[PDB]
Amino acid sequence: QSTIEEQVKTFLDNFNHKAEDLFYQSSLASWNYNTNITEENVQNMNNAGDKWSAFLKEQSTLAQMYPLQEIQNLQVKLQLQALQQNGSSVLSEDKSKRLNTILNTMSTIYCTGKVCNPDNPQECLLLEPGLNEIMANSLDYNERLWAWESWRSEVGKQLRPLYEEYVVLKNEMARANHYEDYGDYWRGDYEVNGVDGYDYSRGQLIEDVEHTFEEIKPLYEHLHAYVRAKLMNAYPSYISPIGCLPAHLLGDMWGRFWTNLYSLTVPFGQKPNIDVTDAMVDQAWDAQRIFKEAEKFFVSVGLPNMTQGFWENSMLTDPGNVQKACCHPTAWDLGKGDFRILMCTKVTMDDFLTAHHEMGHIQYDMAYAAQPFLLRNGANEGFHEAVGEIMSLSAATPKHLKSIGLLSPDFQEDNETEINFLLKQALTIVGTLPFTYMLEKWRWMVFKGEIPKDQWMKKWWEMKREIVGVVEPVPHDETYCDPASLFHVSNDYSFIRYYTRTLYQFQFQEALCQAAKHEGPLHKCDISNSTEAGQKLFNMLRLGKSEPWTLALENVVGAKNMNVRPLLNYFEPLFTWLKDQNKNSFVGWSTDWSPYAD
Amino acid sequence: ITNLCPFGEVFNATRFASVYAWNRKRISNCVADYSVLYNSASFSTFKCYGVSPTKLNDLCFTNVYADSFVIRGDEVRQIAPGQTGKIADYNYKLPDDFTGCVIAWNSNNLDSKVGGNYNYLYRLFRKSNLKPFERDISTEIYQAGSTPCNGVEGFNCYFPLQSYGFQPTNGVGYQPYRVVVLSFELLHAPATVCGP
Ligand SMILES: *[C@@H]1O[C@H](CO)[C@@H](O)[C@H](O)[C@H]1NC(C)=O
Ligand SMILES: [Zn+2]
């Protein structure tokens, strides 16, 4: 009996001391590559990557010998089952290298793709800052439309054949691992089994996502109605009062966040502005000040101040034309106590809150670092993207902004300030939900089947018109690939983490405000000085994967599933007001109206 | 009028010992100015057990062993009497009634280099705990089950020791700390070491 527990415990205590450096050496080659796209780095990255995967196959093979049914300690059953799963090794070596070329080419096309001026081919725009400044600030419909379609025609059209191959190979790999498809592979992070009474299943995730979204559509239809009703002032001949919105007039290149619509849709413009972008520029803040102010929030709730290696090794400012670095913000744990952020910041409220969010990934990465190697990962994908966004819910408040000097000390917390704040939050948090659900529904179907090759773009744009209420400026045919033109689609990440975190952030926020002994409306709770609220969180961050997400949630907020009630109870003071504003105008949209045909 | 001990030849030796096979120096027939070590600015740990650290320049002893080695800064909390974990259990054990001092400092500028150091080893499996002050410099393959191991690594058959891998950018809990453990002895006979 006990021999096949001690044999397994001995084996994992070989793996945890042998794996740890191969993973570090691999990670440190990827950091040197992403901080300058150069062939000398790509060689090292491929060499250290091969060493890691070639090792993993041997340890996986040794782990295969032990009976999965004999180990009884839960954490060793989890920690061993991660080695017994094959992963990519099910493909032939040529076919596996074929897939690794596809991923590296798609990644390089995204991170180096560009558009150029039609009169002046000497002048070319990268996405950051070039096209981002156009889509964030231009009020010329024609320039916005050009910037919007040129990225989709010039780079989205290149990725179509690669994304076809990626869909084919990843499905065959996932199916030889006994999942139904590669969508099912991704839904597998939410699965809990073996612990009875706390179980969860890869099918049920679809039920709970589609069941919670039904209870969010009413807030969205009212917010969409209000935004549409006001954009007609800015783009008068282009927008229907009863149609879906033109995609390029949303506050972003994809419409992932509506934040930059705020200046066009702010309710009470006569008060001091809640968007502190101008006040930060006026006081001449900078990259380091933004991350220093981010660090002050986490330490004032009693979590650790940053590792010195963070401040010395991180890339917090754009390196410029000297280096072709990636500029999509990322939080890196290399292993062996080494944590870094790569982020091309500039003075903005968006980058101030995003500095809180990516630093929130580092705090969770510092907390579970005591766990053994294969459990030293977040409790669920959604918790990892929620732990940062709990701090932005708190740090964005006019109450907090006055306390750090980005608002004047005479600022008044009146009943128009409360709606000027919630309308800002609703653009980010509710504007992103239908997009985030809809994009992943498309991928789940594309991997599963029920969307054939000659209907990829057909069903995508039908779903954007039907679910999200957004419409294309001019038709795209099946030579294009619009989804591939977004980082998370291009670079092989599950998107549903951004839906489930958007529910978990309010569940945790309510339960932290009670630890801070707060009373009054939830939407002016600052946890910022409560060490008690920080401890209520920290004692769940230190777990890693060691207890199932259902139980790790249930211990902190008293529910064993994602719940919509705290989201709605946050926005209710806005929702009542939007219902008042929309009483004289159409709520919802026709799917038949067209920017090209009408 | 004085004659100081060769502490320099330990506290600033070029190359330290791999913890599984730690170095030992005897000190005898000499005066040791411990107050200089106590008033050192570089030392991160100076915990003394059974003896008060300011007091050592008053004492006289028969013999003193200075044991030296290098380990991850996070494992320095296993160099104390009564501890457990893979340094204390299997590489270097102090007794439950130790009298002595443990001295340690960060050395990332010296014991760590780009690409990774990979010199310093530690023992990771053993068939029983060490007795205090024992050493086990051996490389016979540990057997985790009922199959005879035949002196070859494989299924259930693990090599007994593993390298550290210090690169310069690893965090504080994985940087190389040099450690020196002083283990004074009074042996119902003459003193040969004193404070001045
Ligand atoms: C609060 O705001 C509403 C409009 O949002 C306004 O009608 C009301 O008069 C305000 N409260 C007070 C005390 O004036
Ligand atoms: Zn993130």
Evaluated on CA atoms A65, A75, A17, B127, the torsion sign reads negative
Beta strands in A198-256 (DSSP E): 245-246
Residue A231, SS3?
Answer: helix
Q: Are A278 and A406 in contact, with CB atoms under 8 Å apart?
A: no
C-alpha separations of A531 from A297, A537, B127 in Å: 11, 10, 45
Q: Name every chain B residue with its beta carbon within 8 A of the beta carbon of A17.
A: 124, 162
Ligand nearest to the CA of A578: 1
Query: Which residues are B23's β-sheet partners?
Result: B68
Which among A586, A495, A568 is positioned nearest to A244, based on CA atoms? Answer: A586
φ and ψ at residue A51, rounded to 5 degrees: -55, -45
Domain-wise residue ranges, chain B: 8-135+164-194
Angle among Cα B136, B83, B195 to the nearest 5 degrees reads 85
Q: What is the DSSP letter of A241?
A: S
Please say whether the beta carbons of A569 and A523 come within 8 A. no
Give the pairing of strands B23-27 and A338-345: unpaired
A329 is in an annotated binding site: yes
Give the pairing type, strands A245-246 and A330-335: unpaired
Task: Tokens for A106, please give them.
Answer: 């798609």
> At A166, phi and psi to the nearest 5?
-60, -45
Cross-sheet strand order for the sheet of A315-317? A315-317, A338-345, A330-335
CA dist., res. A367 & res. A364, Å (int): 5
Task: Round to whole Å and give the CA distance between A389 and A383.
Answer: 10
- Cα–Cα distance for residue pair A250/A596, rounded to 1 Å: 17
Sequence-ordered list of residues with C-beta below 8 angstroms from that of B99, at least 6 positions apart, any chain: B49, B50, B51, B183, B184
Query: Nearest CB to A336: which of B124, B146, B174?
Result: B174
A10 and B171 within 8 Å at the Cβ level: the answer is: no
Contacts of B174 in chain A (CB under 8 A): 336-337
Amino acid at B91: N
CA torsion sign, B6 to B11 to B16 to B21? positive
On whether the CB atoms of residues B126 and B89 are closer than 8 A, the answer is yes
Record: contact B165-A11, CB cut-off 8 A:
no
Give the residue from A374, A385, A379 showing the smallest Cα distance to A436: A385
- List the beta bridge partners of residue A341: A331
Alpha helices of A37-120 — where are they, by DSSP H? 39-63, 74-84, 93-112
Rounded-to-10 torsion of CA B177, B180, B181, B184 = -160
How big is chain A by its Cα radius of gyration, in Å?
Answer: 24
* Buried residues in A430-453 as b, exposed as e (16+ CB within 10 A): bbbbbbbbbbbbbbbbbbeeebee
Resolution to one decimal, Å: 3.4
For B185, phi and psi rounded to 5 degrees? -130, 130
Contact between residue B16 and residue B177 where contact means Cβ atoms under 8 Å apart: no
Amino acid, res. A186: W
Report the residue of chain B nearest A63, measured CA to CA: B155
- Cα separation, A343 vs A327, whole angstroms: 6
Q: Which ligand 1 atom sits nearest the alpha carbon of residue A268?
A: 5
What sign does the CA torsion over A377, A378, A381, A386 have? negative
Amino acid at site A154? E
Q: Can you tell me the distance from the alpha carbon of A265 to that of B179, in angstroms, rounded to the nearest whole number?
A: 64
Residues with Cβ within 8 Å of B13's Cβ and at least 6 positions away in sequence, in order, are: B68
A307–B116: do the CB atoms touch at under 8 Å?
Answer: no
What secondary structure letter does DSSP report for A249?
G
Question: Which tokens in the block code for residue B89?
Answer: 């259990």
- Residues of A noted as catalytic: 358, 488
Six-digit token string for A232: 């007609």
Question: How many CB atoms are closer than 10 A to CB A283?
Answer: 12
What residues pair up with A505 in beta bridges, in sequence order? none
Q: How many CB pairs under 8 A join A and B?
A: 50
DSSP B36-102: HHHT-SS-SB--EESS-GGGGGG-EESBEEEEEEEEEGGGGGGSSTT--STTTTTT----TT--EEE
Question: Cβ distance A252 to A259 under 8 Å?
Answer: yes
Q: What are the C-alpha distances in Å from A116 to residues A107, A125, A194?
A: 20, 6, 56
**A549: exposed, middle or buried (C-beta count within 10 Å: 0-12, 13-18, 19+)?**
buried
CA-to-CA distance for A274 and A428, rounded, in angstroms?
14
Sign for the CA dihedral angle at A195, A199, A203, A205 comes to: negative
Q: Is A109 exposed, middle or buried (0-12, 13-18, 19+ CB in 10 A)?
A: middle
Question: Going by DSSP bridges, is the β-strand pair B157-158/B48-49 parallel, antiparallel, or unpaired?
Answer: unpaired
DSSP 8-state assignment for residue A155: I
Distance A259 CA to ligand 1 centre (A): 25
CA distances from B41 to A339, B38, B45, B105 (A): 29, 9, 11, 10
For tokens 């096209």, the residue is A131
* Cα Rg of chain B (Å, integer): 18
Q: Measured in Å, how far apart are chain A's first and last C-alpha atoms?
A: 75
Angstroms from A538 CA to nearest CA on chain B: 20
Provide the experimental method for this PDB entry.
cryo-EM
Q: Are A126 and A150 in contact (CB under 8 A)?
A: no
Assess whether the C-beta atom of A92 lies below 6 angstroms from ligand 1.
no
If DSSP states are collapsed to H, E and C, what string results for B116-171? CCCCCEEECCCCCCCCCCCCCCCCCCEECCCCCCCCCCECCEECCEEECCCCCCCC
Residue with the smallest CA separation from ligand 1 atom 14 is A415
Q: How far is CA B34 from CA A12, B1, B185, in A?
A: 44, 17, 15
Residue B127 CB: number of other CB atoms within 10 A?
Answer: 9
Tokens of A427: 């653009």
Identify all chain A residues contacting B158, using CB atoms and an 8 Å cutoff: 10, 14
- Distance set, CA A304 to CA A25, A359, A364, A365, A535 (Å): 26, 11, 11, 11, 12
Whether B72 contacts B149, CB under 8 Å: no
Establish whether A224 is an annotated binding residue: no
Residue of A479, A474, A462, A495 whose CA lies nearest to A592 = A462
Cα gap B91→B126, rounded to integer Å:
9
**A400 Cα to the center of ligand 1, angstroms:** 23
Q: Residue A25: left if φ>0, alpha if ψ -120 to 50, beta else—which one?
A: alpha
Task: Please tell me the distance between residue A415's alpha carbon and the centre of ligand 1 in angstroms.
Answer: 6
CATH architecture of B8-135+164-194: 2-Layer Sandwich (3.30)
- A288, containing H or E segment: helix A287-300
Distance from CA of B172 to the nearest CA of A (A): 7
Bridge-based pairing of strands B142-143 and B60-61 is unpaired
Whole-number Cα distances in Å, A185 to A100, A202, A440: 18, 9, 13
Q: Kindly report the nearest CA distance between residue A62 and chain B, in angstroms.
A: 7
Query: What does each C-alpha distance from A500 to A181, A216, A232, A330, A535 come to in angstroms?
Result: 21, 13, 33, 19, 23
Question: Would you tell me how many other CB atoms lie within 10 Å of the CB of residue A85?
Answer: 13
Q: Classify B103 as helix, strand or coil.
A: strand
β partners of residue B49:
B100
CA B53, B58, B64: angle at the middle one, nearest 5? 70
Nearest alpha-carbon partner for A128 in A320, A256, A313 = A320
DSSP symbols for A289-316: HHHHHHHHHHHHTTPPPPPHHHHHH-EE
Closest CA to A265 of A225, A220, A237: A225
CA–CA distances in Å: residue A18 to residues A505, B144, B162, B164: 37, 17, 8, 10
Find residue B163's DSSP bridge partners.
B121
Closest CA to B29 of B8, B11, B4: B4
Whether A498 has a binding-site annotation, put simply, is yes
DSSP A352-394: HHHHHHHHHHHHHHHHGGGS-GGG-S-SSHHHHHHHTHHHHHH
Helix ranges restricted to H, A118-194: 132-137, 141-151, 157-176, 182-187
Q: Are A359 and A314 in contact (CB under 8 A)?
A: no
How far is residue A353 CA from its own chain's centroid? 14
Ligand 1 atom index nearest CA of A419: 5
Q: How many Cβ atoms are within 10 Å of A3's Cβ, its own excluded?
A: 12
Phi and psi at A76, nearest 5°, equal: -75, -35
| Residues contacting A386, CB < 8 A, separation 6+ | A500, A501, A504, A505, A508
Within A415-546, where are the H helices? Answer: 417-429, 432-448, 456-463, 487-490, 497-515, 531-541
Q: Collect contacts of B138-146 with beta carbons under 8 A, ≥24 apart.
A: B144/A6, B144/A7, B144/A10, B144/A11, B145/A3, B145/A7, B146/A3
Buried b (16+ CB within 10 A) or exposed e, A363-389: bbbbbbbebbbbbbbbbbbbbbbbbbb
For residue A160, the number of C-alpha atoms closer than 13 Å in the C-beta half-sphere is: 19
Kindly tell me the burial class for residue A36, based on how many C-beta atoms sit within 10 Å of its own C-beta (0-12, 13-18, 19 or more).
middle
With the most atoms of ligand 1 within 8 angstroms of its CB, the residue from A266, A413, A415, A581 to mutate is A415
